[PDB]
A paper describes a structure:
Many sequence differences between different SARS-[name]-2 variants and variant sublineages have been mapped to the spike protein (S protein), a homotrimeric glycosylated membrane fusion protein. S protein initiates cell entry by associating with the major host cell receptor, the human angiotensin-converting enzyme 2 (ACE2), via its receptor-binding domain (RBD, residues 319–541 in SARS-[name]-2). We report the application of ancestral sequence reconstruction on coronavirus spike protein, resulting in stable and highly soluble ancestral scaffold antigens (AnSAs). Cryogenic electron microscopy (cryo-EM) structures with high local resolution indicate how an intricate network of hydrogen bonds between the RBD and N-terminal domain (NTD) maintains the AnSAs in a closed pre-fusion conformation.
Nodes 3 and 5 were selected because they are closely related to the extant S protein sequence of SARS-[name]-2. The ancestral sequences representing these nodes were referred to as AnSA-3, AnSA-5, AnSA-6 and AnSA-9 and share 83, 79, 80 and 55 % sequence identity with extant SARS-[name]-2 S protein (Wuhan wt), respectively. One dataset of each protein was collected in one session and readily yielded 3D reconstructions at an overall resolution of 2.59 and 2.77 Å for AnSA-5 and AnSA-6, respectively. For instance, S284 (A292 in SARS-[name]-2 S protein) creates a novel hydrogen bond between its sidechain (NTD) to the backbone of F310 that is located immediately adjacent to the RBD domain (bottom left).
Residue numbers in the entry:
A (entry chain A): 664 to 1010
B (entry chain C): 267 to 650, 659 to 713
C (entry chain C): 912 to 1110
D (entry chain A): 317 to 415
The structure:
Amino acid sequence: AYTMSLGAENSIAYANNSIAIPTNFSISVTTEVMPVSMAKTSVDCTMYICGDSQECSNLLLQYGSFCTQLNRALTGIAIEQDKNTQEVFAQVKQMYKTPAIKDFGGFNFSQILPDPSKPTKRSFIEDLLFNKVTLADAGFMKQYGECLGDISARDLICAQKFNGLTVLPPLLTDEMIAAYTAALVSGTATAGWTFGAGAALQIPFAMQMAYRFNGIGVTQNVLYENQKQIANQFNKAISQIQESLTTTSTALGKLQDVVNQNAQALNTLVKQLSSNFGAISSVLNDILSRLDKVEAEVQIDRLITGRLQSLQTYVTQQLIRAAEIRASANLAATKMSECVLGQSKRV
Amino acid sequence: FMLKFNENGTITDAVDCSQDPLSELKCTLKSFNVEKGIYQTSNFRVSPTQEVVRFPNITNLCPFDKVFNATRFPSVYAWERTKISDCVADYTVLYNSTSFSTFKCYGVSPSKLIDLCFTSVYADTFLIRSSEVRQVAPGQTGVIADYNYKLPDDFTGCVIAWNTAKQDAGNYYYRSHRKTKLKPFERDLSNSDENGVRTLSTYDFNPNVPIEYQATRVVVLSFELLNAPATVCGPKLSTQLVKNQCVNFNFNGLKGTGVLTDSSKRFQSFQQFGRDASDFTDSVRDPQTLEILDISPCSFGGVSVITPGTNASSEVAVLYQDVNCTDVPTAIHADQLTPAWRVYSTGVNVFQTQAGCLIGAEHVNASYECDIPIGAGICASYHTQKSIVAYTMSLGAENSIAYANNSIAIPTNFSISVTTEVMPVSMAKTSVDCTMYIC
Amino acid sequence: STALGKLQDVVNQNAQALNTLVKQLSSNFGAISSVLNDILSRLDKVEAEVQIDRLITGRLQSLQTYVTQQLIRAAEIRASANLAATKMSECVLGQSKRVDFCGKGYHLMSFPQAAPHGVVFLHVTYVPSQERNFTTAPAICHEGKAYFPREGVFVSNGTSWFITQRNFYSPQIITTDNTFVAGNCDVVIGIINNTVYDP
Amino acid sequence: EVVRFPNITNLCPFDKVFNATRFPSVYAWERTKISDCVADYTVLYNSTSFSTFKCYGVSPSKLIDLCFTSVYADTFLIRSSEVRQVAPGQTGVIADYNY
Ligand SMILES: *[C@@H]1O[C@H](CO)[C@@H](O[C@@H]2O[C@H](CO)[C@@H](O)[C@H](O)[C@H]2NC(C)=O)[C@H](O)[C@H]1NC(C)=O
Ligand SMILES: *[C@@H]1O[C@H](CO)[C@@H](O[C@@H]2O[C@H](CO)[C@@H](O)[C@H](O)[C@H]2NC(C)=O)[C@H](O)[C@H]1NC(C)=O
Ligand SMILES: *[C@@H]1O[C@H](CO)[C@@H](O[C@@H]2O[C@H](CO)[C@@H](O)[C@H](O)[C@H]2NC(C)=O)[C@H](O)[C@H]1NC(C)=O
Ligand SMILES: *[C@@H]1O[C@H](CO)[C@@H](O)[C@H](O)[C@H]1NC(C)=O
Ligand SMILES: *[C@@H]1O[C@H](CO)[C@@H](O)[C@H](O)[C@H]1NC(C)=O
Ligand SMILES: *[C@@H]1O[C@H](CO)[C@@H](O)[C@H](O)[C@H]1NC(C)=O
Ligand SMILES: *[C@@H]1O[C@H](CO)[C@@H](O)[C@H](O)[C@H]1NC(C)=O
Ligand SMILES: *[C@@H]1O[C@H](CO)[C@@H](O)[C@H](O)[C@H]1NC(C)=O
Ligand SMILES: *[C@@H]1O[C@H](CO)[C@@H](O)[C@H](O)[C@H]1NC(C)=O
Ligand SMILES: *[C@@H]1O[C@H](CO)[C@@H](O)[C@H](O)[C@H]1NC(C)=O
Ligand SMILES: *[C@@H]1O[C@H](CO)[C@@H](O)[C@H](O)[C@H]1NC(C)=O
Ligand SMILES: *[C@@H]1O[C@H](CO)[C@@H](O)[C@H](O)[C@H]1NC(C)=O
Ligand SMILES: *[C@@H]1O[C@H](CO)[C@@H](O)[C@H](O)[C@H]1NC(C)=O
Ligand SMILES: *[C@@H]1O[C@H](CO)[C@@H](O)[C@H](O)[C@H]1NC(C)=O
Ligand SMILES: *[C@@H]1O[C@H](CO)[C@@H](O)[C@H](O)[C@H]1NC(C)=O
């Protein structure tokens, strides 16, 4: 046990007549990871609560619109996940095809553009990102026959499907997302910022970087006078991204934990069906087998209200988490416009 | 059915919710008119029409005569326990011969006894005066409950008693005092104390005594309903199996509904049913063949109905989520469906989307802007006659930039643009009088 | 009609939430009746209170649901109101360099207009149009030393080299006023030879 | 378990309350206060069997280890048919017009 270090100890050699001027520079490439969407969860509220039984379903009608109101909430979450994706990507709906030459002024975009030798039209970097996040529960999409196996084939995802819990697929497939990012990097490589304001105007890439140096307040000559250095520093920095993404799993933790949180929530929701909630049994057919309506209904009501309470908890948690994902998607959409479609003075 | 009631309270419209996918949509949305969209739809397609009842073929009738009509019962201090096993509990044979002034059951309804099966039964028997049968219940107190025969709080079973003042004349004993109460189903046969005088009081039973003092026989049946072989069953006859259909079933008194199939499951030698982490009973041992059947939900898998507005058309399309188009007629139990739904099982206008099989929308190779979002790149629209068409959505216009290392495009003109951005700032300031709403 | 859909759906969502809350009073929640006086008329307190408790708990649960949805929706409206307040400061009370913040194109102005439960911004933007291809060079070499554009870019109309501002073609004579000189012209890749006029 | 109870020791007057020479007519039911005594009701097990023993707000099995801040005993004679009317929420000639 120890006290935290707040930071490195440092001092500034202040004097009323002294200044430090940088004599050199480093081109730095930095990775920012942002969540944009979450799993479009869906619930058959009758199948979850009453588990395919008429007696319970006829009791559940006496609770009114609770189920309809929960489904209305979750479909609101689901539609919002597609909105989030189409607000971050799809800001530019000119599908600028990837240029045939991936080197501009010495800057080697080949790792961040698609490669036509591969079967999947991702960039090389995007292939690393799609490998480095894992859908640790095998990621839903359980095929029609797959839940009818031996004992060892039992699976919380089959327990989910049998109890009415499902994940809808996103509207944009990954090939469509990769097509937008390919178009966005292609416009930046060949038309700079202009295609964010209007029609894309081609400009030579070094000449575009020279304007970007002026935006920083480094004189235009300092680019051309060092263009091979600057391009090499850029190329090496991109390679360091590729090396870190191939080696290191923690980089995308902000996305893996969105997967983990939503997987865990669905797992607790199915497991809550094993609770009695003070009924004689957690099992609905066991009550209906063993008790007659005059007193079964008292036991069923304990299950209905407890199960129904467990759904309302889950939907509230999803509404909370969805608001956080929306805020991240709104921020990511702002960074697309301001960092990709332009140059930002915002420190 | 969903029924629309007029202000005069006459029915003016109705939807048969099982009829077709539009009817299921209307019933799912609790509404007779539906806006354009795609909606998750609750299963009204299928309901069980059959019972699959299967019970062990044990045929020996339970020993009601030997247990109830024994020549004499025990003194309550010396109550006797017997195991009842491998028999059919057709208790209706008694209706001809006795009437019980108490028949009271715990954890089981008495009307259910005729179609349950029990993994264990023990009958306890003793004689007490009629006023004391009151005390033979969980949580009771009194000379019987304290010092002669205690039921547990977790008791499941039935207490049965009848007057026998004509039969059970004589002397019978009960413990009036003890230094500590009995534990549940404890017995204490000690007659003499340390010095030799008896610790037991005597019932004097005669038909001449007042009713409250007259002898009643009591039988206490204690039950178990474990995940173990059935030992006593009600008289139910067994039916044939009906696999691959949504049915009601009853295996050893475990009722339910679902789809039965063969299964790969290894059960334990004693095990009668299996449950997943949700306690959903996913398998059962057939008591007739000892084969293990899988139980699937009748409603299993997601279904969604795609519609223009019902103001626009009564045409719909159905998405069978994660189902392959050749499996739809079996994932949906299309043999059990109406003809109007079975149209949406098969035929032309089936299209395998990565979201699932889409049926009833014709696939079109022209891409358009997304109208109704089906998923995984597919959208649908009500499109020119009109029909529901399904297509891959267009991401944007095809374009290319004429890049060269020495070419630049400069704007020669400009447009002043005025753009409208609409932003919500407020919502209605709702308020609730919580007492007026609730009470 | 669709232009204000973002306002109409705030109205619609809040109307629908109140309508479902009144309709929820029609539920029994497993009581013998949804109607409170019907229970109290028909049952004695010893056992009416068991039925009344089922109504109280289910009704109170329905309020807790409604209030939770309102807290969620109010957090969303607050984020929209904070963003609208930021656009008032940055797009109305100034001019914003933030690329897509005050509408598409380069922001000139915007005007706020009141709307029910909302604001409408009329964003005014310059959109460049009718672009034309030009040959261009990073620098001019005049007398062994490299001249760079002071602002804009060097372009030629085929015959002649000019300096123009980048967002509107207005060619100027390349003058020691329009340009700064920095270093010998060997280093600049793509350097070209042209006169620089000296007034 | 730390069990601590007041050290009152006088046994409650079960014989005088229950085995009185006669009970009141139900219209003239009599109330008596019971106080400063130990309610070891098991002394009755030897001598009297009760065809009704029904408790409200307390389980009868818990009577042996509770203490009460007041006790009153109401006593009256009725026909056995009518004892069902001696309960909360009952009706009938007793519940309406006698007790
Ligand atoms: C900034 O520092 C780098 C070294 O980190 C300098 O790069 C070296 O430059 C000399 C002469 O140009 C070469 O001989 C070395 O091989 C270079 N090394 C590397 C790693 O590039 C660079 O010149 C410095 N920049 C400026 C403007 O002086
Ligand atoms: C751009 O970067 C790549 C390195 O990623 C350069 O080298 C090629 O890299 C791929 C793997 O990424 C190999 O399969 C090729 O064989 C490599 N080619 C060579 C010649 O080494 C690529 O050359 C770079 N482009 C430019 C124009 O420098
Ligand atoms: C920009 O384009 C507009 C047309 O879109 C030009 O305006 C036209 O100019 C001619 C001659 O002056 C008129 O006859 C037309 O009526 C004008 N059109 C409109 C809509 O007013 C304008 O001259 C161009 N600007 C520049 C700087 O070239
Ligand atoms: C559905 O089709 C895919 C091939 O497109 C196949 O991999 C999968 O196993 C099929 N599902 C079933 C249940 O046969
Ligand atoms: C209700 O009944 C009255 C009288 O029969 C009739 O005039 C009125 O039109 C009815 N209302 C509706 C909505 O049909
Ligand atoms: C019912 O009792 C009659 C005589 O009282 C007897 O003949 C008959 O066999 C009895 N039936 C059963 C089922 O015990
Ligand atoms: C009990 O058994 C005796 C002897 O067989 C018989 O006479 C009597 O009728 C039986 N009682 C009942 C209720 O069956
Ligand atoms: C009775 O049970 C046995 C064992 O479970 C089985 O072999 C037999 O087929 C069943 N039915 C008949 C009619 O024998
Ligand atoms: C759409 O294009 C595919 C090409 O793979 C073709 O097979 C199919 O017949 C086309 N559909 C129509 C309706 O023309
Ligand atoms: C610029 O040149 C390319 C090829 O010469 C051409 O495709 C493009 O349309 C030109 N742009 C303009 C604005 O004329
Ligand atoms: C280029 O512009 C100059 C204007 O000073 C003009 O004299 C020359 O002819 C132009 N050339 C072409 C090809 O337009
Ligand atoms: C531009 O490209 C041409 C070949 O297309 C080449 O000859 C020339 O040296 C290049 N110049 C620059 C500045 O990239
Ligand atoms: C520019 O001028 C210098 C000196 O006159 C000459 O050496 C060089 O080759 C020229 N460049 C071109 C491209 O003509
Ligand atoms: C009531 O008191 C009388 C007189 O002492 C006694 O004979 C009788 O047995 C008592 N009753 C009971 C039930 O103890
Ligand atoms: C119990 O009854 C006996 C007589 O049967 C009597 O002698 C004894 O005192 C009684 N005990 C109590 C505690 O009343």
